[PDB]
Amino acid sequence: GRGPGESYPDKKESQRFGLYDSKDVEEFVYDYPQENGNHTDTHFLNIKFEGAGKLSIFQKEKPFNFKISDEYGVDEAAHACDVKRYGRHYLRLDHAIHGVGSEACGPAVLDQYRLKAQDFNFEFDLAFE
Amino acid sequence: SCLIPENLRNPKKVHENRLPTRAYYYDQDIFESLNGPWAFALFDAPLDAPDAKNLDWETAKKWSTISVPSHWELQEDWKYGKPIYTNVQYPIPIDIPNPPTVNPTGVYARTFELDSKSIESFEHRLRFEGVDNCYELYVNGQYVGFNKGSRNGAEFDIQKYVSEGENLVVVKVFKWSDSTYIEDQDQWWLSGIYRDVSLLKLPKKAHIEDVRVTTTFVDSQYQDAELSVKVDVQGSSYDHINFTLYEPEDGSKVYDASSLLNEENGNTTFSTKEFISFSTKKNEETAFKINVKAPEHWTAENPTLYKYQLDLIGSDGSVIQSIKHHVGFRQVELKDGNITVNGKDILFRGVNRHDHHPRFGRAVPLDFVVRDLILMKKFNINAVRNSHYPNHPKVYDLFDKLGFWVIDEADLETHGVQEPFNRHTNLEAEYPDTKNKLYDVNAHYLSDNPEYEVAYLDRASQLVLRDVNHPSIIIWSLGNEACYGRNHKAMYKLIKQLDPTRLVHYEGDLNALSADIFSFMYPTFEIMERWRKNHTDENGKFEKPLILCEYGHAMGNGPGSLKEYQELFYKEKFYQGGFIWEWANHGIEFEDVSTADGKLHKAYAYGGDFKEEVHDGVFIMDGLCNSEHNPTPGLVEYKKVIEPVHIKIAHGSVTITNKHDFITTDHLLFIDKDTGKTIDVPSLKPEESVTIPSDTTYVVAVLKDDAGVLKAGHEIAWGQAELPLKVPDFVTETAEKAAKINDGKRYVSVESSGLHFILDKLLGKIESLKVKGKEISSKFEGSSITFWRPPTNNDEPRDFKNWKKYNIDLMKQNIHGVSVEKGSNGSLAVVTVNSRISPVVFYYGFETVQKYTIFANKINLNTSMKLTGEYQPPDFPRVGYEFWLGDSYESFEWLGRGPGESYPDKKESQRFGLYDSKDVEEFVYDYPQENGNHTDTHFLNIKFEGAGKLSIFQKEKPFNFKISDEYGVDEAAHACDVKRYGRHYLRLDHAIHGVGSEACGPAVLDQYRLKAQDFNFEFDLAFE
């Protein structure tokens, strides 16, 4: 998919397509904790387990979004050090994600990047090696 | 300690309500199998398990099922945990006699149907062939009894508890108990009902309980024998017994898996050829003794058996019960200080065999045991030691029929008591003549502990009484590595009392105070030899002989020097041979992520793979066969050294000596392999020899006809005349051809017609050598001459440590000068390289001169290496060149030893011949290590696709070579972890270090060590 860093519907084109390894990437820490670490236009995701191979994940007919982290309490966290962390990781596996825009000062997320309220239909395979 | 149940912490509570041990006989009419799926649940500890006195079938019915027999650490998806491997160390804390409070408890349940008539007709028993570690038994919500002894059997009377219709059997199985302390064999820790369970239906009013068969020669000349038969009948309602002995079937009988496993009787008419009959009379002793006229001897080389039928007969004259079995006429004695069978002082050509299967563990299907034993016979083995416990009772008939000398061993090892001592005192090494003093200090915990006497005696009683009628068993053994104490003496007394006919072995009893035999494990020759002399008096008499119950540790590449052990065996009457440790690697099949691949592969697990708290790593992988129970080069070598016929060819003569104990050479066809025509060889008795004049180079001794489990044409023994190193008649092109020579800044170039030679002066590296369409180049990382090999299991404890310490893997070639001159005596050019070959951080190294003499069709490489500097390593793994082979490379062919690998102290089974790489299956080691070397190579031909061959040979002396594409062997934990290049390389070596057995035993013997010294050798690279 897109990488090496994070990507969003209206902020993704600098992240070229390729095969990426989590180990090769320095995850970006925001000064003010907020939504981060999403990968958009993901063709497939491999999750490696110690001595048990990989879990391959892909979405039918359309690329998907994902984040893998151990973080929480990001909403209330004022600074990087305020961010809480679980004792295990989670996968956030998303069909779709709202754009990012510049509305703190400037235009709202453009119409074609807004995740508009509508019906959702999507199929995922969880393929185990 | 009320949170651990009394019976799990009481050494005297060996069983409750178990029937006395009797001789095992399988009978299809009496044995009903209870194997199959059983309800099963696992609990953290006994207190979480249900009270079986209240457990309904309706309740148990709802549990998951497990299949009996099997271990619960070997289930689909490891549902009930994983195997644990320890060698010495206990996997629990030591607090004798307490097990851990957290103690895995498995509860088994199933039902069986009983008839109205069945309860009237039969006494009903339950028989369990083996359950690890111990268990309590319930029938119909009622407690029947308790049992300990994981590899012993147990019977329980069920008559009182049985009901018409549905009956419920519940078995509570515990992983740890006081028994754990005496079950510490170097093997996998595995639990559950791992052997057969049976319902026995014996005739009620009267039935045969026990039988005892002995064959004793009346005479000093081992001819006439007394056959004694003692029957214990239970109940009153019988008249007498009949005995019918049948005419013998010669030990050369043909068998196969099918006929060996056939269990049919009842309506099958056992035999017809009646030899002897006998009847007891009403109200008389149900035993007798009969004089037998010059019977056919039973022997491991010729296992001749007389079948018999024993009938219990009622008042009406009908047959109440039959036993169909066999007699083996043989007698074992300690005679003139030797173990003697039928007067003859025998030689053990033995092996230690554990119960192991790569998928089922110790729950080995009989099919697979037959596989083991056939393979043993195919590789010249004649003896088996049941290390270190009795096997499934049905195995012993296999020994009887196939012919093995058997040491049946008590289920008792106490080794773990030593571990804290070993660590506290920083103990490095144990030696066979001295080590018993280290065990003496801890004997008081168990083997000298009076609380354990009942248990120790039980292991002895159970061992002997179950297997007492098998002629193949000639020695009872008190266990393994359990120190020495009063309990061992008690065991000895009991065994002689129960079975006076056999000898007693116990290695832990150094001075054989309560044993009949001396026994060492892994001794040096010096140590064997001192012992001999201290136990041979002035007359030349000895009182007891020495065996090696374990020697030639077969872990990985090895063992080395089986030759030198064997020379000792044949030389002295005092030595009666030994048993290799071990028959097969204990690998368990599992899925490993590959280091090379990032993918999942089938592999064979040892310690660490199942992520144990404590484990002993690769030490489980120490067999002559691999985890899949197939021959390694270790077994191939063993077959040769122990071959029962010697064939020597020298001075226009073939000398053939018969090295069997009993049989002649008559069954063997001797072929002159140079002509294909047979050699007429007279019938040779044990120890007899004949010299036959002949022009032959290579003689083979082969089986005339199918016999036992061996096929006509099977190779028993062979010999060769020594092959002189002949210089191949390759024609060097010395014609005057102009050559373009460019001695550049860094690279030197020699170009001629069909030739292109480029050398990097900075590195001493051949960038490219392309002669007549064939290309090679240096495989270069630091040096053009390298010294490293992937350490064997034997290398690991010392030699590897030394080589690593001295940085032998980091040898660098530092070029000082390169000299370039025009050719002289037919040569095109002479390129001379002057350098120091030395590892970083060290002084020591070789002042080296490499002289390349270049011809149109040949390159002569003269290597001079002069060892210099302070602080030198003692030895090297190897010394030689590494070359990349060009893309055209397709196969190779060599004159030398083959078809498999060979090493200085492990080579004689690989006979001289011309071998083709295509005809050979390359052996894969379970643990990746040094492999695939070919020693004593006369010449090597490397074939390139549509470009002919490159012939390689060393002047005045044969050489060593390996051709592979493999790397990353050092770090590879399993076969699947081994990395592979996109092209092949040649490892071309002047010399190579021996292999030895130092993982456990003697170091590589002095004459096989590649000692640090100057090296001088010349190679020709001849291009077709």
Ligand SMILES: OC[C@H]1O[C@@H](O)[C@H](O)[C@@H](O)[C@H]1O
């Ligand atoms: O492989 C090491 C072997 O060493 C012996 O001393 C022992 O009796 C064997 O059972 C095994 O532990």
Ligand SMILES: [Mg+2]
């Ligand atoms: Mg041991």
Ligand SMILES: [Mn+2]
């Ligand atoms: Mn803060």
Ligand SMILES: [Mn+2]
């Ligand atoms: Mn591996």
Ligand code: NA
């Ligand atoms: Na925040």
Ligand code: NA
């Ligand atoms: Na052990």
Ligand code: NA
């Ligand atoms: Na001998």
Ligand code: NA
């Ligand atoms: Na071992």
Ligand code: NA
């Ligand atoms: Na390795």
